[PDB]
CSV table of C-alpha atoms and ligand atoms in Angstrom, one decimal:
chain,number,residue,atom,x,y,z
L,982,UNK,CA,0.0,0.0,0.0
L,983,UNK,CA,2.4,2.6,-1.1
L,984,UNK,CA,-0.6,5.4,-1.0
L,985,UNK,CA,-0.4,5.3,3.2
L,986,UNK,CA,2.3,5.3,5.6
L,987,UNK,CA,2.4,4.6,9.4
L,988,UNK,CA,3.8,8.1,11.5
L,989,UNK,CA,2.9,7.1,14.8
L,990,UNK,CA,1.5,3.6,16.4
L,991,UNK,CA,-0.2,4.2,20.0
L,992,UNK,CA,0.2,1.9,22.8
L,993,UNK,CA,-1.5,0.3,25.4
L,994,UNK,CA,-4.7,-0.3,22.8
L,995,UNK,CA,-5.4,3.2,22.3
L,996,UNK,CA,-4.6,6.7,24.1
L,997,UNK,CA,-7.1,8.9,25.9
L,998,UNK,CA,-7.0,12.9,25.9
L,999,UNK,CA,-5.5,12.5,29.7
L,1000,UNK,CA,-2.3,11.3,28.4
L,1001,UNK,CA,-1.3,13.2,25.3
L,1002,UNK,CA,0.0,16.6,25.3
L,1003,UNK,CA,0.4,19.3,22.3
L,1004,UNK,CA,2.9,22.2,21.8
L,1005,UNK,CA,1.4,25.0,18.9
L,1006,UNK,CA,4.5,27.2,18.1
L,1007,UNK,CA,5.1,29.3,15.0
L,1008,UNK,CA,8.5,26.9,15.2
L,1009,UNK,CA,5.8,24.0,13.4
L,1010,UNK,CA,4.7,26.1,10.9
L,1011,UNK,CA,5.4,25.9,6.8
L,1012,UNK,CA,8.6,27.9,5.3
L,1013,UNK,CA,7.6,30.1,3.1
L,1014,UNK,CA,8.3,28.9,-0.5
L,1015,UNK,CA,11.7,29.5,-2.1
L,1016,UNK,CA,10.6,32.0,-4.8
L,1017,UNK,CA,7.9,33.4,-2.0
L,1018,UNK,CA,4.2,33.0,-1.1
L,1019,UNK,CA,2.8,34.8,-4.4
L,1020,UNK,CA,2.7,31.1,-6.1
L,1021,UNK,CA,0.0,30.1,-3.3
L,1022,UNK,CA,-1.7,33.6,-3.7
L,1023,UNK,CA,-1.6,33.4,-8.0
L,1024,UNK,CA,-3.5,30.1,-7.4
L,1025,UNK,CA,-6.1,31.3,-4.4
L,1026,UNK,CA,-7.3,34.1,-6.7
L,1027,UNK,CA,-7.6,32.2,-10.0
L,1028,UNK,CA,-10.1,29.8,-8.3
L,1029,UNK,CA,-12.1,32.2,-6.4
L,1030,UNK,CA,-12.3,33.7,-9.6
L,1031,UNK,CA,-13.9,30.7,-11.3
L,1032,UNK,CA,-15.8,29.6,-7.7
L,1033,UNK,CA,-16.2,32.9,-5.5
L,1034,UNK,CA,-18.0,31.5,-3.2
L,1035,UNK,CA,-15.1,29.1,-1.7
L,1036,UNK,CA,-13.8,30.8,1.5
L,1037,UNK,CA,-10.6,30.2,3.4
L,1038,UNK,CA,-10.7,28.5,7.0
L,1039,UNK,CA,-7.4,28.0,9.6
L,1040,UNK,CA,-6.3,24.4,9.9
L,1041,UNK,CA,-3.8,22.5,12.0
L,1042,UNK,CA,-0.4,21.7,10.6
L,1043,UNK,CA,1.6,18.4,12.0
L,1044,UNK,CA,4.8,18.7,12.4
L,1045,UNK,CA,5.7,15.5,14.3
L,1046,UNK,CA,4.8,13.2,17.2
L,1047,UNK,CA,7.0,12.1,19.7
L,1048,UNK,CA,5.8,8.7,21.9
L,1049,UNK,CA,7.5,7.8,25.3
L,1050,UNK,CA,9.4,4.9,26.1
L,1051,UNK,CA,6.8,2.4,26.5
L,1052,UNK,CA,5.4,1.6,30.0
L,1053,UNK,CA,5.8,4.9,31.5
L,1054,UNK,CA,4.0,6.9,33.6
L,1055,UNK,CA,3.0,10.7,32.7
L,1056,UNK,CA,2.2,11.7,29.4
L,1057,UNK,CA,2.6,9.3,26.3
L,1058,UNK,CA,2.5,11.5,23.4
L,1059,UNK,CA,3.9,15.1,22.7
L,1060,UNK,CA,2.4,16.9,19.0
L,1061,UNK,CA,3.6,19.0,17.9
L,1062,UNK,CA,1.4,21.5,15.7
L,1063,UNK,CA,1.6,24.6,13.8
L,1064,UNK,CA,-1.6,26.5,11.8
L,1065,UNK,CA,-2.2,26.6,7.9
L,1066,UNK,CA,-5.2,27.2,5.9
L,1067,UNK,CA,-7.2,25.4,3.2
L,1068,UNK,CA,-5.6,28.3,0.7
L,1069,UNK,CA,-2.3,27.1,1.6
L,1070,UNK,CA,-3.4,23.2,1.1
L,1071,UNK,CA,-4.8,24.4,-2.2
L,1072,UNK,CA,-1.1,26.0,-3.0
L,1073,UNK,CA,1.2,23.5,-1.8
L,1074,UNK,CA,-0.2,19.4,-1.1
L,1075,UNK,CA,-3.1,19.8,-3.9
L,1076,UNK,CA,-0.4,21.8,-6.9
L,1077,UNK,CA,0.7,19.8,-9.7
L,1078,UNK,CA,4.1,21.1,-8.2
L,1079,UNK,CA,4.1,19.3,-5.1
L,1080,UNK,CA,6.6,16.5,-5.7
L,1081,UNK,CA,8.9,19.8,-6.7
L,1082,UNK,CA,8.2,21.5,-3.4
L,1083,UNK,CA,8.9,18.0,-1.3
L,1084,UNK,CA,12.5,17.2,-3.7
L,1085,UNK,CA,13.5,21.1,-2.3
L,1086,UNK,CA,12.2,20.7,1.4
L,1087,UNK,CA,14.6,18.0,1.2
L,1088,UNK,CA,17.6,20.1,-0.1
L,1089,UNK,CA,16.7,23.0,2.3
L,1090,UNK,CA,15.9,21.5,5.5
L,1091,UNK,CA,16.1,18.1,5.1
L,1092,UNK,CA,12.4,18.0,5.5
L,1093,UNK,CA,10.2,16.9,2.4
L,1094,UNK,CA,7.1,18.2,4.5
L,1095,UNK,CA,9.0,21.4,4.9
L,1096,UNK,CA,7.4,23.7,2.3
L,1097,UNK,CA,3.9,21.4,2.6
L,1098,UNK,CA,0.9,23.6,3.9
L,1099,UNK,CA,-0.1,19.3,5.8
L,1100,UNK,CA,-3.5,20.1,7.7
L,1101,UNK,CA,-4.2,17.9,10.3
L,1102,UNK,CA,-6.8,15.4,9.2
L,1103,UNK,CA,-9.3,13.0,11.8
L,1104,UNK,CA,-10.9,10.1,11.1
L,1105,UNK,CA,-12.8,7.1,13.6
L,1106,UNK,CA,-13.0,3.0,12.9
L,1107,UNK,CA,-16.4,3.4,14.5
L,1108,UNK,CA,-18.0,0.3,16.1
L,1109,UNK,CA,-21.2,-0.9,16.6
L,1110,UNK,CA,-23.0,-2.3,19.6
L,1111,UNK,CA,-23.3,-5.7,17.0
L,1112,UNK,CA,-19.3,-5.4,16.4
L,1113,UNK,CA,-19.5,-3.7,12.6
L,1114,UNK,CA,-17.0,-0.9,11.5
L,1115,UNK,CA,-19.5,1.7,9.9
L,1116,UNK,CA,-18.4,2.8,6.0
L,1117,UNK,CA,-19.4,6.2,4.0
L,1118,UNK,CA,-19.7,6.2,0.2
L,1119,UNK,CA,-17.9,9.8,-1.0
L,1120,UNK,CA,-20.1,11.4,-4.1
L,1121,UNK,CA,-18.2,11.0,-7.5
L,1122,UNK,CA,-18.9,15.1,-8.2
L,1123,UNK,CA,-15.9,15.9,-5.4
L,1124,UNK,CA,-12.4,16.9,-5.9
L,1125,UNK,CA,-10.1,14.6,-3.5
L,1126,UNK,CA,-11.1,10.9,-4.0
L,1127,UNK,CA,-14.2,10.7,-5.9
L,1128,UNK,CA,-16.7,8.1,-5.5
L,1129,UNK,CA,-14.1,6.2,-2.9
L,1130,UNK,CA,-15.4,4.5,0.2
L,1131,UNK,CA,-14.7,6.4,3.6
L,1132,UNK,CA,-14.8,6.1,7.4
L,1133,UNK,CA,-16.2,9.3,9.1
L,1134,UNK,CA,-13.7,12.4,9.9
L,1135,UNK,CA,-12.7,16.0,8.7
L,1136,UNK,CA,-10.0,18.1,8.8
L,1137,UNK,CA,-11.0,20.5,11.9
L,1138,UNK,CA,-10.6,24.6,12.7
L,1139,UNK,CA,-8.4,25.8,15.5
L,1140,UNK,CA,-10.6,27.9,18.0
L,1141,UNK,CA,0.9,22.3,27.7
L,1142,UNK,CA,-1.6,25.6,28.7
L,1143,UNK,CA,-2.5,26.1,25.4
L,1144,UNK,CA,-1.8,23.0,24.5
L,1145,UNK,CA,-4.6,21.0,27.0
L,1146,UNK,CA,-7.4,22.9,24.7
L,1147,UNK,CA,-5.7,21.8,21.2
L,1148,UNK,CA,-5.7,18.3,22.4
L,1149,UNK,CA,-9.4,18.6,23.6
L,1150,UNK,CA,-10.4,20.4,20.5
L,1151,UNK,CA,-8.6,17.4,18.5
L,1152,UNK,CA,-10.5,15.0,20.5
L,1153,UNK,CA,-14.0,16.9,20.1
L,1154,UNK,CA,-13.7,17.3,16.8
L,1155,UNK,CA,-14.1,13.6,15.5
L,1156,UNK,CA,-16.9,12.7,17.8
L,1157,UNK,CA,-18.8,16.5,16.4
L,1158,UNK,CA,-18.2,14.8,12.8
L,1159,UNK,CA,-19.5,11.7,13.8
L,1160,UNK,CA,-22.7,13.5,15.1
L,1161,UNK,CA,-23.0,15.6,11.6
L,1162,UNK,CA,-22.6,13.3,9.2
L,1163,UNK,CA,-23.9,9.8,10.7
L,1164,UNK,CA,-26.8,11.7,11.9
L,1165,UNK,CA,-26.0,10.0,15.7
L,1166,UNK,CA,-26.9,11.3,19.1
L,1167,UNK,CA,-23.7,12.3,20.8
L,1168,UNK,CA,-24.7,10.5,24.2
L,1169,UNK,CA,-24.6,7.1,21.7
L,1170,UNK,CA,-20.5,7.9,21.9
L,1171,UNK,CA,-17.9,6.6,24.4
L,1172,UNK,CA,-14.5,8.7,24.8
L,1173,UNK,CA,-12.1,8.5,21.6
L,1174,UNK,CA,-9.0,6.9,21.8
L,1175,UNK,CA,-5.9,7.4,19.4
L,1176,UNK,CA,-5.3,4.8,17.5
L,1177,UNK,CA,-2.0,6.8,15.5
L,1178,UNK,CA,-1.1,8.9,12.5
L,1179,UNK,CA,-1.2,8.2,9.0
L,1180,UNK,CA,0.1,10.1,5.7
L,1181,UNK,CA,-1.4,9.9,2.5
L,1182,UNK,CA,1.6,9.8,0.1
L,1183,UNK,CA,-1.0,11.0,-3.0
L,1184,UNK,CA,-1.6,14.3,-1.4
L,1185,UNK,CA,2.2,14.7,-0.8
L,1186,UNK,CA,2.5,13.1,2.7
L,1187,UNK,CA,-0.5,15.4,4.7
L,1188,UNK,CA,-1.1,13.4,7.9
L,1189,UNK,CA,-4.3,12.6,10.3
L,1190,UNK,CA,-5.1,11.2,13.4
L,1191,UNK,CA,-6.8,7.9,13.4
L,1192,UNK,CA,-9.3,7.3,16.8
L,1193,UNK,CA,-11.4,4.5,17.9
L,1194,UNK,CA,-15.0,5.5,19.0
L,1195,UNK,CA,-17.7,2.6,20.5
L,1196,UNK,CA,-21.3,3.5,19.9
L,1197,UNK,CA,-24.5,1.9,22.0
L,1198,UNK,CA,-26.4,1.5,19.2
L,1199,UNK,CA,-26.5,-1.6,16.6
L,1200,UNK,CA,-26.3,-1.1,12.9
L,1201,UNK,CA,-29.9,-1.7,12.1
L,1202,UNK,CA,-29.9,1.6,14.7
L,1203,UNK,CA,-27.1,3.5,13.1
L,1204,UNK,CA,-28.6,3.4,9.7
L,1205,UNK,CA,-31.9,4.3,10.7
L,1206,UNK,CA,-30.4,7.7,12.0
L,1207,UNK,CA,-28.4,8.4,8.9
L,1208,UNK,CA,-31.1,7.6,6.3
L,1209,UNK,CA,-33.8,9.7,8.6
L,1210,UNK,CA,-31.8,12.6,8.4
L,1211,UNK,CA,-32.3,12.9,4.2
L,1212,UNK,CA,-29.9,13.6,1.3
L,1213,UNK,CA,-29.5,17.3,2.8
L,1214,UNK,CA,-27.8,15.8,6.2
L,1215,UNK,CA,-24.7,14.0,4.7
L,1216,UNK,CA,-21.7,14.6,2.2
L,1217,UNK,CA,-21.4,11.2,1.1
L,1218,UNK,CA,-23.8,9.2,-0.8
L,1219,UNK,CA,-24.6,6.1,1.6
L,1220,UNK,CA,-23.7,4.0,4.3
L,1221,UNK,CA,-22.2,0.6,4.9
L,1222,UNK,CA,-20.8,-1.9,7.9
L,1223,UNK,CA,-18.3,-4.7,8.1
L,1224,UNK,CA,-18.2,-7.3,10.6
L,1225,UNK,CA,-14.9,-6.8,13.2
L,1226,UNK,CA,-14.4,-10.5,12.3
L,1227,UNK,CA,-14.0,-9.5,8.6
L,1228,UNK,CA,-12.1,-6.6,9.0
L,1229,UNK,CA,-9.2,-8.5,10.1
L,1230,UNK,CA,-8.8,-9.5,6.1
L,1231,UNK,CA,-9.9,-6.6,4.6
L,1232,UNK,CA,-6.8,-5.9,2.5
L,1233,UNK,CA,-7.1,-9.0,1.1
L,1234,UNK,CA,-10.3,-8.2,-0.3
L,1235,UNK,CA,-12.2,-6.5,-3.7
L,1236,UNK,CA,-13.0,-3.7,-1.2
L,1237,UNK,CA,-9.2,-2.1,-0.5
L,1238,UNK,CA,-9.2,-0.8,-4.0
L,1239,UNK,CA,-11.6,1.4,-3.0
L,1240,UNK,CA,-10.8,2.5,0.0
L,1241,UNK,CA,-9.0,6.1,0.2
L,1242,UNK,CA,-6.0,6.4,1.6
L,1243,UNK,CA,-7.1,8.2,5.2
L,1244,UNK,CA,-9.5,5.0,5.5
L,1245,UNK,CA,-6.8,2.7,5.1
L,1246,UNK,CA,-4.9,4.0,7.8
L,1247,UNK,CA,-7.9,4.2,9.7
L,1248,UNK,CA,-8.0,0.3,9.0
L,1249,UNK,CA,-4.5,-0.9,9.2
L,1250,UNK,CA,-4.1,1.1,12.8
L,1251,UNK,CA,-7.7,-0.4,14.1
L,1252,UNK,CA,-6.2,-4.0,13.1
L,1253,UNK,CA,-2.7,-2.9,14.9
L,1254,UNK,CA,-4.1,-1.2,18.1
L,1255,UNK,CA,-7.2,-3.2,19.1
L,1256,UNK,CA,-7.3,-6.4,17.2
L,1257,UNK,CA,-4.0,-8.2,17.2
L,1258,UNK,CA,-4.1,-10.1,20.7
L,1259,UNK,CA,-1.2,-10.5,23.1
L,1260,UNK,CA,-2.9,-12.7,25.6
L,1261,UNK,CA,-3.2,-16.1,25.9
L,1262,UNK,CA,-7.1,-16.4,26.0
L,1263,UNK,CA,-8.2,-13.9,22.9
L,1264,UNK,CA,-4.8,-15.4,21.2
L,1265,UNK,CA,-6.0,-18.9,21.5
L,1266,UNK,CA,-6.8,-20.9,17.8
L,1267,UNK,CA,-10.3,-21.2,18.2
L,1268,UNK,CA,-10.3,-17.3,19.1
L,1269,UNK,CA,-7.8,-15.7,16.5
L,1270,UNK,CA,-8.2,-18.3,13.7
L,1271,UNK,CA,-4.4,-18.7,11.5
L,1272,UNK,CA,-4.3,-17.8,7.8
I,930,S1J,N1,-8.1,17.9,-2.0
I,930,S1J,C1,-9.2,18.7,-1.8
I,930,S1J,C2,-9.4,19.8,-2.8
I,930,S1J,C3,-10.4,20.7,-2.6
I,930,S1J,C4,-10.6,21.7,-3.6
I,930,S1J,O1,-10.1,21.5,-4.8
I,930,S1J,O2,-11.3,22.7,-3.4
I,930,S1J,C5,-11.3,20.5,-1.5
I,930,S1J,C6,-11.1,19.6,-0.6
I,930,S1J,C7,-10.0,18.6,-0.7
I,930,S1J,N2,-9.8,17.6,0.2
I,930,S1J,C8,-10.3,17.7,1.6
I,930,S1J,C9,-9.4,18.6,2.5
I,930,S1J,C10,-8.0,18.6,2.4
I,930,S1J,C11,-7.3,19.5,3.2
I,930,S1J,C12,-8.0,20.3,4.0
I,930,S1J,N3,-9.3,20.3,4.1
I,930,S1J,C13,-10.0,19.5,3.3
C-alpha cells in the first residue's frame, strides 16, 4: 500500500486525551516557499475567480509526534502542531508542483514536509454495539477521492496551557463529525481513543489522526439515524458496515481498491491497536483463527 504510511502507532490499545500533550509554536509552521508565497496567492485568486463563493478556514499543521518509552508513567505523546489554511493546502499538497516542493524541502531542511501547507486530518473506525466498523460512500462530483469509500472524519478549525485545549479540541472534533454526518446522538458515543497517525503519500505526505469510537447503538440503529436525516444531512452518498471478524482480512479483499488512503490508515491502525491479541485467551486458535 504505497498510498499510506504509518507516523505514529499508539500503545497500550489506544490513548485517551488525559495522556497526550500538544505544543502549537510558529516553530511548526510551513517555510515560506523559495521563490515566496505569491505562487500560493496566483492560485487562491484564480479559483475564487472561477468559484467565488469558496472561502478560506485555519487548519492545524503536524509537524511531528513524539511517543514515550513504553510503559511509563505521565504523558505518552507530545504533537507537535503549527496553523495553515485550506488556501495554503490548495497551493502547496493539492499543486501539480508538489513533488517539486517535497525534492527542495529535502535540499533546504532536510524536510520533504518542509514547504507542505499538511493540515491535520481525523478520522474514527467506528463500532457498533453488534461489532460492525460503519463505512461512507464519497459522491463521485468531489475533488479529493471521488466516488471512494470512507470512514467518518474531517479536517478540523483551530478555535501544555495552550496546549490542553488543542488536544481537547482534537478529540471533540471527531466525535462533532460523527454526530453531523452519521446523523448520531452524541450521548450514543464513548470517549475516543488514538489509534496513530497516518500520511497519504498522493496528497504529498499530509497526515491525520486515526481514533477508535464505541457507539450503544447496533447497525440496524445506526442506519436508521443516517437515512432519517435525508440527502440534505450527509456529504457522502450512503452508508455501509463490516463485521470486526472481517475486518481483520480486509486488504485481502475487492474492497481495499476502493478505500482512500485516510480510511486505510484508519483500517490498518484499528487491526494494529485493538485487534492483534497479546494474551493467551483472545490469542488462542479457536479465538484468532491462523491464515
Ligand atoms: N483535496 C481537496 C481539494 C479541494 C478543492 O479543490 O477545493 C477541496 C477539498 C479537498 N480535500 C479535503 C481537504 C483537504 C485538506 C484540508 N481540508 C479538506
Amino acid at each position: 500500500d504505497p498510498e499510506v504510511t504509518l507516523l505514529l502507532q499508539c500503545p497500550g490499545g489506544g490513548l485517551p486525551q488525559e495522556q497526550i500533550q500538544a505544543e502549537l509554536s510558529p516553530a511548526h509552521d510551513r517555510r515560506p516557499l523559495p521563490g515566496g508565497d505569491e505562487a500560493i496567492t496566483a492560485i487562491w485568486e484564480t479559483r475564487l475567480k472561477a468559484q467565488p463563493w469558496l472561502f478560506d478556514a485555519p487548519k492545524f499543521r503536524l509537524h511531528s509526534a513524539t511517543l514515550a518509552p513504553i510503559g511509563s508513567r505521565g504523558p505518552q505523546l507530545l504533537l507537535r502542531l503549527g496553523l495553515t489554511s485550506y488556501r495554503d493546502f490548495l497551493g502547496t499538497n493539492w499543486s501539480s508542483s508538489a513533488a517539486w516542493l517535497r525534492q527542495q524541502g529535502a535540499t533546504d531542511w532536510g524536510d520533504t514536509q518542509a514547504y507542505l501547507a499538511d493540515p491535520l486530518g481525523v478520522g474514527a473506525a467506528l463500532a457498533t454495539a453488534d461489532d460492525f466498523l460503519v463505512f461512507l460512500r464519497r459522491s463521485r462530483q468531489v475533488a479529493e477521492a471521488p466516488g471512494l469509500v470512507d470512514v467518518p472524519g474531517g479536517h478540523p478549525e483551530p478555535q501544555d496551557l495552550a496546549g490542553q485545549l488543542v488536544v481537547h479540541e482534537l478529540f471533540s472534533s471527531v466525535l462533532q463529525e460523527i454526530c453531523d454526518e452519521v446523523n448520531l446522538p452524541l450521548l450514543t458515543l464513548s470517549q475516543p481513543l488514538l489509534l496513530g497517525i497516518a500520511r497519504n503519500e498522493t496528497s504529498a505526505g499530509r497526515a491525520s489522526a486515526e481514533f477508535y469510537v464505541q457507539c450503544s447503538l447496533t447497525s440496524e440503529q445506526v442506519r436508521k439515524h443516517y437515512l432519517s436525516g435525508g440527502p440534505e444531512a450527509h456529504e457522502s452518498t450512503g452508508i455501509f458496515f463490516v463485521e470486526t471478524q472481517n475486518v481483520r482480512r480486509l486488504p485481502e479483499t475487492e474492497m481495499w481498491a476502493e478505500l482512500c488512503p485516510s480510511a486505510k490508515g484508519a483500517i490498518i491502525l484499528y487491526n494494529r491497536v485493538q485487534g492483534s491479541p497479546t494474551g493467551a485467551a483472545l490469542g488462542s486458535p479457536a479465538l484468532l483463527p491462523p491464515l
